[PDB]
Design a protein around this ligand. Structure first.
Ligand SMILES: O=c1cc[nH]c(=S)[nH]1
Ligand SMILES: [Cl-]
Length: 232
């Protein structure tokens, strides 16, 4: 299911059942985004990630989400973006520098060995929502699909999470992410804020922030199951 299905089919056919219900208020908007992508392709432009990966974050159960890690836009380099924020396919090398920095902090914080590869699917399977605010990008043009309609979709998703009484920890990397705090506050969620892991900002406070262990301390304090962050 790629852009054809995104344009033409109900959410219940595209994403996990809980997510389909949570996103119902933006069903028309998702369909419009499918048409946007079809228009791009008809104009001889590409987009990233692959159509089948665009909504991938919403294919893991809504009910199990306990941590939100928000990103801005997908990786712009062809072959990096896979529909989970910051993740790459297992054979990608070197890792994008943002992901290398995330993993540096992972090992510093948790004491586990560096991951074997850049595939964050295990986190998604364990209740971490790896959500970019904007879900597509034109190759090699960072942020090029900003303002095209994705923000309403992803805001709807985050609002649905925040509105639940269930515990939520939001890891908010950089200034754009910190704009989510009004929804999070009213939902009685907790945020961990730091500079972003991009090499542009990481050494101004991302390193040493210990977001993985802190998220788990917050979760346990709230009566939730912590995340098993261990990657192979
Ligand atoms: O998915 C990604 C990858 C890098 N950076 C951001 S903000 N999101
Ligand atoms: Cl189509």
């Amino acid at each position: 299911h790629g852009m054809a299905s995104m344009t033409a089919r109900p959410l219940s056919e595209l994403v996990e059942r809980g997510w389909a219900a949570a996103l119902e208020p933006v069903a028309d908007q998702v369909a419009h985004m499918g048409q946007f992508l079809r228009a791009e392709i008809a104009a001889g432009r590409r987009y990233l990630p692959a159509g089948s990966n665009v909504l991938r974050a919403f294919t893991f159960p809504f009910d199990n989400v306990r941590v939100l890690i928000v990103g801005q836009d997908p990786y712009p380099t062809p072959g990096h973006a896979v529909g989970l924020s910051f993740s790459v396919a297992p054979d990608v090398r070197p890792w994008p520098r943002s992901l290398a920095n995330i993993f540096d902090e992972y090992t510093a914080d948790l004491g586990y060995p560096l991951p074997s590869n850049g595939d964050l699917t295990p986190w998604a399977q364990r209740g971490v929502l790896l959500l970019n605010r904007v879900l597509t990008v034109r190759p090699s043009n960072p942020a090029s699909h900003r303002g095209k309609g994705w923000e309403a979709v992803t805001e709807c998703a985050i609002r649905a999470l925040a509105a639940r009484a269930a515990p939520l920890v939001a890891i908010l990397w950089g200034r754009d992410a910190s704009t989510l705090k009004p929804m999070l506050a009213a939902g009685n969620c907790v945020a961990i804020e730091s500079p972003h892991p991009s090499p542009l900002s990481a050494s101004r406070g991302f390193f040493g922030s210990r977001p993985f262990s802190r998220a788990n301390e917050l979760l346990v304090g709230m009566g939730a199951e912590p995340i098993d962050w261990r990657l192979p």
